[PDB]
From Swiss-Prot:
A Gene Ontology cellular-component term: cytosol
Annotated compartments: Cytoplasm
Record EC number: 2.7.1.71
Record remark on domains: Consists of three domains: the CORE domain which forms the binding site for nucleotides, the LID domain which closes over the active site upon ATP or shikimate binding, and the substrate-binding domain which functions to recognize and bind shikimate.
Binding site for ATP: 11-16, 116, 152
GO biological process: amino acid biosynthetic process; aromatic amino acid family biosynthetic process; chorismate biosynthetic process; shikimate metabolic process
Other facts noted in the record for this chain: The phosphoryl transfer proceeds by an in-line associative mechanism. The random sequential binding of shikimate and nucleotide is associated with domain movements that suggest a synergic mechanism by which binding of the first substrate may enhance the affinity for the second substrate.
Organism: Mycobacterium tuberculosis (strain ATCC 25618 / H37Rv)
Stated name of the protein: Shikimate kinase
A GO molecular-function annotation: magnesium ion binding
Gene that encodes it: aroK
Function: Catalyzes the specific phosphorylation of the 3-hydroxyl group of shikimic acid using ATP as a cosubstrate.
Pathway(s) the chain acts in: Metabolic intermediate biosynthesis; chorismate biosynthesis; chorismate from D-erythrose 4-phosphate and phosphoenolpyruvate: step 5/7
The family this protein is said to belong to: Belongs to the shikimate kinase family.
Length: 169
């Protein structure tokens, strides 16, 4: 089972923190989005476009539950995985790190040409605030440690992480 599970919105640092936290703890990183593409042979975008979000969430839930059982390092969950009650259920008892980010920073950090079915222009900032508003309680419900990525250098938020895992609370 994973040493840590990372949850948060797109732009919250899951891939980069994942990377730094993993190096720090000395294990591998798995991203569930990558795992979905591997198992299905399909792009995330294609699944949403052709089969739709609900089918994506079912696939995602199965991949996440498997990953929680089978992987021993750091696991990063796609930003919408916590909307699935079965995912929240499976997270019970794990160490779960919520990477908190404000809308402005999150919006800035997601503004490239990455394909994002749920965060595509125009009015991306409105869409991001909507996701935040809906998902905030769900991240909070599952998380065992929260870290602020808004201002801190990454390598730092991670110190908060490696240090935190280690001592009581
Ligand atoms: O907000 C979402 O529902 C999604 C976030 C993405 O994960 P990241 O947060 O890893 O980009 C990816 O799973 C997909 O585009 C759906
Ligand atoms: Cl790494
Ligand atoms: Cl899901
Ligand atoms: Mg980096
Ligand atoms: Mg893809
Ligand atoms: Mg299916």
């Amino acid at each position: 089972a994973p040493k840590a599970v990372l949850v948060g919105l797109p732009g919250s640092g899951k891939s980069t923190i994942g990377r730094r936290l993993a190096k720090a703890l000395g294990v591998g990183l798995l991203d569930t989005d990558v795992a979905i593409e591997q198992r299905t042979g399909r792009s995330i975008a294609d699944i949403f476009a052709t089969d739709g979000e609900q089918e994506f969430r079912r696939i995602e839930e199965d991949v996440v539950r498997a990953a929680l059982a089978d992987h021993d390092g750091v696991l990063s969950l796609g930003g919408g995985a916590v909307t699935s009650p079965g995912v929240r259920a499976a997270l019970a008892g794990h160490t779960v790190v919520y990477l908190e980010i404000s809308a402005a920073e999150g919006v800035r950090r997601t503004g490239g040409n990455t394909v994002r079915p749920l965060l595509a222009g125009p009015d991306r900032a409105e869409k991001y605030r909507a996701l935040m508003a809906k998902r905030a309680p769900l991240y909070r419900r599952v998380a065992t440690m929260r870290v602020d990525t808004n201002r801190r250098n990454p390598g730092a938020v991670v110190r908060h992480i490696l240090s935190r895992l280690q001592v009581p609370s």
